[PDB]
Amino acid sequence: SCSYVVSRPVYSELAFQQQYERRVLKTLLPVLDWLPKYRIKEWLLSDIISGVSTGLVGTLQGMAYALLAAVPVGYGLYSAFFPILTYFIFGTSRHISVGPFPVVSLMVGSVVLSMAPDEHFIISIDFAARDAARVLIASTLTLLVGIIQLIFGGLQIGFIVRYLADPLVGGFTTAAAFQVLVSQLKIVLNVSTKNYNGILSIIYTLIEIFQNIGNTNLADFIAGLLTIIICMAVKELNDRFKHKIPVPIPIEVIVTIIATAISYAVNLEKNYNAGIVKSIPRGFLPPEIPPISLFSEMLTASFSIAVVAYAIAVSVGKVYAIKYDYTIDGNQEFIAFGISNIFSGFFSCFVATTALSRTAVQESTGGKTQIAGIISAAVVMIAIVALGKLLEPLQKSVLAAVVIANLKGMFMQVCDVPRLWRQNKTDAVIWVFTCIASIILGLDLGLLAGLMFGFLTVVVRVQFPSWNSLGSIPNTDIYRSTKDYKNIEEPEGVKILRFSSPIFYGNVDGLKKCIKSTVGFDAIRVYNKRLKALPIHSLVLDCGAVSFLDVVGVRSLRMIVKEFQRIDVHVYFASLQDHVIEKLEQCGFFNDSIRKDIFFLTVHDAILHLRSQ
Amino acid sequence: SCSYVVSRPVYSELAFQQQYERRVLKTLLPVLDWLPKYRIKEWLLSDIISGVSTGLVGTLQGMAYALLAAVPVGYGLYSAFFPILTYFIFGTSRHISVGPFPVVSLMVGSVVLSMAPDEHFIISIDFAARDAARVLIASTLTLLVGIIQLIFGGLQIGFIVRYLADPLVGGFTTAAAFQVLVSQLKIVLNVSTKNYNGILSIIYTLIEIFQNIGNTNLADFIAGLLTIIICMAVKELNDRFKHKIPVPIPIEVIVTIIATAISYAVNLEKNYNAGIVKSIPRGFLPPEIPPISLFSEMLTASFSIAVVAYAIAVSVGKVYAIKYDYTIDGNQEFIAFGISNIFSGFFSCFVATTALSRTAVQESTGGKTQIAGIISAAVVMIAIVALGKLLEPLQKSVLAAVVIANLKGMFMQVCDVPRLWRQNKTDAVIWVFTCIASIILGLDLGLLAGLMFGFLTVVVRVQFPSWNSLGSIPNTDIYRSTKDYKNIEEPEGVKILRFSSPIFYGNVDGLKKCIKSTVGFDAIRVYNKRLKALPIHSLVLDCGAVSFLDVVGVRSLRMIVKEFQRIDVHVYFASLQDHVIEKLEQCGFFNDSIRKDIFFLTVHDAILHLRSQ
Ligand SMILES: CCCCCCCCCCC(CCCCCCCCCC)(CO[C@@H]1O[C@H](CO)[C@@H](O[C@H]2O[C@H](CO)[C@@H](O)[C@H](O)[C@H]2O)[C@H](O)[C@H]1O)CO[C@@H]1O[C@H](CO)[C@@H](O[C@H]2O[C@H](CO)[C@@H](O)[C@H](O)[C@H]2O)[C@H](O)[C@H]1O
Ligand SMILES: CCCCCCCCCCC(CCCCCCCCCC)(CO[C@@H]1O[C@H](CO)[C@@H](O[C@H]2O[C@H](CO)[C@@H](O)[C@H](O)[C@H]2O)[C@H](O)[C@H]1O)CO[C@@H]1O[C@H](CO)[C@@H](O[C@H]2O[C@H](CO)[C@@H](O)[C@H](O)[C@H]2O)[C@H](O)[C@H]1O
Ligand SMILES: CC(C)CCC[C@@H](C)[C@H]1CC[C@H]2[C@@H]3CC=C4C[C@@H](O)CC[C@]4(C)[C@H]3CC[C@]12C
Ligand SMILES: CC(C)CCC[C@@H](C)[C@H]1CC[C@H]2[C@@H]3CC=C4C[C@@H](O)CC[C@]4(C)[C@H]3CC[C@]12C
Ligand SMILES: CC(C)CCC[C@@H](C)[C@H]1CC[C@H]2[C@@H]3CC=C4C[C@@H](O)CC[C@]4(C)[C@H]3CC[C@]12C
Ligand SMILES: CC(C)CCC[C@@H](C)[C@H]1CC[C@H]2[C@@H]3CC=C4C[C@@H](O)CC[C@]4(C)[C@H]3CC[C@]12C
Ligand SMILES: CC(C)CCC[C@@H](C)[C@H]1CC[C@H]2[C@@H]3CC=C4C[C@@H](O)CC[C@]4(C)[C@H]3CC[C@]12C
Ligand SMILES: CC(C)CCC[C@@H](C)[C@H]1CC[C@H]2[C@@H]3CC=C4C[C@@H](O)CC[C@]4(C)[C@H]3CC[C@]12C
Ligand SMILES: CC(C)CCC[C@@H](C)[C@H]1CC[C@H]2[C@@H]3CC=C4C[C@@H](O)CC[C@]4(C)[C@H]3CC[C@]12C
Ligand SMILES: O=C(O)c1cccnc1Nc1cccc(C(F)(F)F)c1
Ligand SMILES: O=C(O)c1cccnc1Nc1cccc(C(F)(F)F)c1
Ligand SMILES: O=C(O)c1cccnc1Nc1cccc(C(F)(F)F)c1
Ligand SMILES: O=C(O)c1cccnc1Nc1cccc(C(F)(F)F)c1
Ligand SMILES: [Cl-]
Ligand SMILES: [Cl-]
């Protein structure tokens, strides 16, 4: 077939250079972009239906997620209502819904509980003062998170989500699922367990729950178990029988309605001392400015909460945008969510994000422009104003049971771990380290530890690269490692070394060790021995994989060249990229008889040049 | 001259693979290694002289460095005595001296002061109890540092000193010089300033010193100024006139003797209320076991102290070993220094290390085997037993003045900073960040921040690499960027892209963006538009600089290949290293009609193969 034929002179860097010469409306993204461009002819009915459905789902989700945070049920409605209204303007996406997403709710609740516990705040008990303190701390944390998100949006740094590797995301998700399960089990069992702050908190909580297992309430446990079993069974039959009924079956809403109807009918509150919500405020509360003096004690938590919320939001937005063939702006997502968090924090709400489940519920029922979000907000406010009394007899164990029932997918990555280990050990190590760190630590501390561990793994992978001693395949210009192909012939009196990495301090130490091992000796000892008394004549370095360079690398290269020229051994460089060559130039490498004449394009011109002498 | 001529068939990876087939006495290092091999015939006199000289220097240095730590003068003699005795056995080096090196002393003193201040420990004042508490905390910290060093020596991890980059070392040195200067100025001025713990401590200390400047003592200030001026002048004339007198002139010892003689003669203590040492214990104290319960509050400081001490010791040892043509074992250095720190901590001493200045004093006076260390220890114990009373009238301001006078070299890196910025911006950024962090923080926190910032800089340099669009030089097989050489011709209907970095998640996002920019479009939009309705026909990737790979990179490559094959665009790979090829193989890349037939050795076989069709 085709053959490889070429004829040209041998080109060093100097000769090659001699012969060839070198040398205002998007930042505040309005509704004005699509509102005039609307398609009211057919989109309105779909928007209305989708908004009604997603509002019905989001009301229950906000009521349920208010328990993950140490906030009374009723503020979740505000957290579902205000962020949608303030995101309708600055939002870039077109199919997402805004709400708690209980993981962020659990982070906020952990912060609030650790910053205001029962024994420290109250030495008597005053439920109202404790609730007010918890609400104030939640609002302050929300405001701080919003400020941080807005600041990050202003700086145009939205690529930090790249640093959230998939294995660490999976490990963090599994650990968060464990934390949520433990907290909701504590809620279901109706056992009073004092909070633990610090490391190994979950173990102490589980130990004390098992100790106090003797005080559990029978009715709440039975209701939770029945709800979990029913929801899991209906979800399993929905998953197995999937060709029909594209809309998900609203088993949770039916379960909640039946549970509250029975609770009101037979009055579990006074006959069995059951745990009901017992209180839902009516109307809208006036705004209150949070105290900013607490900002000094909520930095390392607000940073992680903002990062996690933004990452979830952009992930869901991209997943839907690639399906519907459009794009979203990451920095505008930062700006919109920061403004939304500020506005909600001024109105006694906790952090709001995308909730992929509710997003799918909204989209599968005729997903269209953000008018459905406005309709959902209208449904939520109608529920707030009037339907507050009808949900009074509902038990909190039912909501906790639903939250637990929706945790299986977060529990199903332990099956992905073994294949990940089989494919690449580093990814499995990152997964396990992130999971363990998030287990015995706070969630935010675990996230930060996982990020820095990923950075460390990248640095270590760069620091210990591959290296080889190369020889030529006969009658060709192909050089491969001598110990692998069994037909590689070593040239006479010259060594070829490949060091497949950029060169920095760790790499300069590694490269010195590799050179000493490959050449069979070192220049310093032989020079000293020869001075006291009073096999290789050339060395070629293949630098095709050298990405970048620093001052320490240049110093090490200069020292190596000088030491090898002391004992009459020539060192040549080949396949060096240009930008590395100017990096060498501006670091003062080309001084004291270097002259750039020892640089070649590939490792076959150097061999021919050596053979010419 | 010589020409480049080669003739061979075009080799893909599959054809190339088909045609060529692949496939107990050192851990406890004794004195027994050199003691029988001694050269007592001529080495003994040199050892005696060098030991006497270095003991005379080390006595004064230990007495002076005891003020940097919040420990009374007298324990520095123990810290100079015990570590030499316990290092004579396990030591690998042959020319170093063991002692405080005031930077580590200042770190220890900062820890001790922050863990036991005047107001908290004493509500009255009891000097003896405060001194006992400071000594106990110093001993406990020394024991913890020794345990950490021994543990690190057992694990055979001695290459962590590679992570201490030169710019961060220079910045840390400058910041430590500033801290030492401020503390010793506070000591010289004889002004009482309450300690500050936390961030911005040095600024508050300086502000309060300037506020209390009205209470300074005249005699101590005059003595310190005179000592500093005299020492600086003598050192300057010694440096300028250097051809003669190879041994350094002991101006410091003469200054100390004259100062103490005058102080005893005219009795500054009672006539001017001067600050003298006023107390030196006689004899040896019995050992006391430190309380281990404090270990929980000294981890992040002991880690940094151990790392810094080990780094200084190995640096000086290597500098002298390369001169005297021998080698030292890093892990054995860990073991020896950990055992030494444990032994000294059991005997009320602080951390001991190499003190390059005293090492040079020892070596320049006939450097030989470690017998000189034993002689120096003998001189130190003779000074302890008998000469304790003669140093009573000496002022502490003189010692502080000497410590300040020896700080110029640590202050002389601000001149190195500008050239570092001119050569490589990243190194200057690391230097400035380390200096600023060590200024407004603790020294250990600054060191940790500098290490993690170096890791971040390496990760960022890897994450944003170089990329280019390549074309061929006519009548050759050399491909260079089209926009640089002005004679590069772009081939017909094919694009060549070089992405000079390994591929991971940040790199996969960058590579997707680069491919989209280079090819002028993307596959998803054109595929969707063509489906709704119902310039480039080949792409070559130059992967010569791809070092390693992960699962995310493999997934991204698979997705890119599939998306480009959807719209009838062929993607080829060239210059991929072997180990990357097996990494692709074991990640499941070669599924669904890949067949390894799209891999070529270099980017000229791919072009010829394309031209054959
Ligand atoms: C973008 C890149 C990442 C940025 C990350 C930024 C992190 C910022 C941390 C800020 C920080 C360190 C500052 C130095 C950091 C040095 C790092 C060195 C790194 C290298 C080695 C501030 O440190 C000081 O803390 C003081 C309180 O201790 C605080 O209050 C003082 O002054 C007040 C008047 O101003 C006065 O009213 C008050 O009385 C004073 O005390 C000071 O204002 C503040 O300066 C530590 O604070 C963080 O917040 C909490 C504090 O309690 C603490 O909460 C945890 O508690 C749970 C257990 O209970 C735990 O389980 C949770 O997790 C978490 O809820 C966190 O743990 C801690 O971290
Ligand atoms: C190889 C790689 C590096 C390894 C680095 C290892 C560092 C280990 C730090 C250990 C640590 C964090 C543990 C969790 C870390 C989470 C990291 C998350 C990372 C991701 C984001 C322990 O944290 C807890 O601290 C408690 C005390 O607060 C301590 O005592 C509790 O139980 C006791 C009975 O056991 C009981 O008697 C006691 O009453 C209890 O309180 C607990 O035992 C201990 O668990 C923090 O402690 C460190 O030490 C000091 C504590 O005060 C503190 O001192 C600083 O003070 C100066 C200002 O004053 C400051 O200027 C100085 O610098 C420094 O002197 C340090 O700042 C702090 O860091
Ligand atoms: C289908 C789902 C939604 C129905 C949920 C309704 C809940 C409130 C009902 C269903 C089954 C009920 C339980 C059935 C049996 C008993 C035993 C009796 O000695 C005490 C009441 C108790 C423990 C009931 C409490 C209330 C209960 C848990
Ligand atoms: C080792 C290989 C062959 C296992 C292949 C099957 C995998 C997917 C399954 C089989 C049994 C599973 C384990 C069963 C029990 C536990 C204990 C609990 O902590 C959950 C994780 C863990 C540890 C599971 C991890 C995933 C697992 C190992
Ligand atoms: C990749 C890098 C950033 C990871 C760093 C993790 C470090 C900082 C963490 C991981 C686990 C942590 C330890 C977990 C448990 C305890 C016990 C407690 O009584 C004192 C703190 C101590 C001893 C912690 C010190 C800090 C620690 C060692
Ligand atoms: C050469 C070096 C080592 C000599 C050091 C000796 C010291 C103790 C001597 C040298 C100069 C002396 C000072 C000279 C002048 C005065 C002014 C007088 O009104 C009070 C005493 C005072 C302030 C002296 C104090 C002691 C002093 C500082
Ligand atoms: C105790 C106080 C005074 C400490 C102050 C430390 C800071 C402010 C100092 C110490 C060393 C200084 C640097 C030394 C050298 C240069 C190079 C030149 O281009 C001026 C700026 C720059 C980069 C300086 C910036 C300020 C700097 C970082
Ligand atoms: C900057 C270019 C043009 C010349 C560089 C010359 C170098 C060797 C010298 C000349 C003068 C020096 C500066 C003079 C004074 C100070 C104040 C103090 O904070 C130390 C840093 C700094 C800022 C010095 C840094 C180093 C410096 C800039
Ligand atoms: C590369 C990595 C390790 C750098 C990390 C630097 C971070 C952790 C450090 C650098 C400077 C620090 C800040 C310095 C000063 C203050 C003011 C104080 O009242 C609260 C803490 C706060 C706000 C610190 C928070 C932590 C901080 C932002
Ligand atoms: O997912 C949760 O945590 C959750 C909590 C309370 C109610 N509903 C929840 N989820 C959920 C998910 C899909 C469909 C539905 C619904 F439509 F049936 F309401 C609810
Ligand atoms: O998106 C979802 O549906 C989802 C569900 C459970 C956990 N995590 C989820 N998402 C998700 C995506 C990216 C990053 C993160 C994380 F950062 F919080 F870990 C979460
Ligand atoms: O360097 C110090 O901090 C120091 C402190 C006290 C005494 N002498 C010191 N140094 C020092 C340095 C070189 C030579 C001599 C001496 F030989 F003159 F004693 C002393
Ligand atoms: O070796 C010396 O003489 C010296 C003098 C001043 C500062 N630092 C010195 N050494 C030195 C060498 C390596 C690492 C370190 C550091 F880690 F402490 F910063 C110090
Ligand atoms: Cl969900
Ligand atoms: Cl010194």
Features:
binds cholesterol, mainly alpha, binds Lauryl Maltose Neopentyl Glycol, elongated, six-stranded mixed sheet, STAS_dom_sf (chains A, B), 613 residues, binds 2-{[3-(trifluoromethyl)phenyl]amino}nicotinic acid, binds chloride ion
Structure overview:
The first copy, chain A, has 26 helices and 7 strands. Chain A is elongated and about 105 Å long. Chain A has a 6-stranded mixed β-sheet with strand order 3-2-4-5-6-7. Chain A has helices at residues 13-19, 43-65, 75-90, 102-115, 118-121, 127-154, 166-189, 201-212, 218-240, 251-266, 268-271, 299-324, 330-345, 356-364, 371-385, 396-405, 408-411, 416-423, 425-439, 443-463, 482-485, 505-519, 523-533, 551-566, 578-586, 605-611, and strands at residues 3-9, 466-472, 479-481, 494-500, 538-542, 570-574, 599-600. Helix content of chain A is 58%, strand content 6%. The two termini of chain A are 36 Å apart. By secondary structure, the first copy, chain A, is mainly α. Bound molecules: Lauryl Maltose Neopentyl Glycol (AV0) (2 copies), cholesterol (7 copies), 2-{[3-(trifluoromethyl)phenyl]amino}nicotinic acid (4 copies) and chloride ion (2 copies).
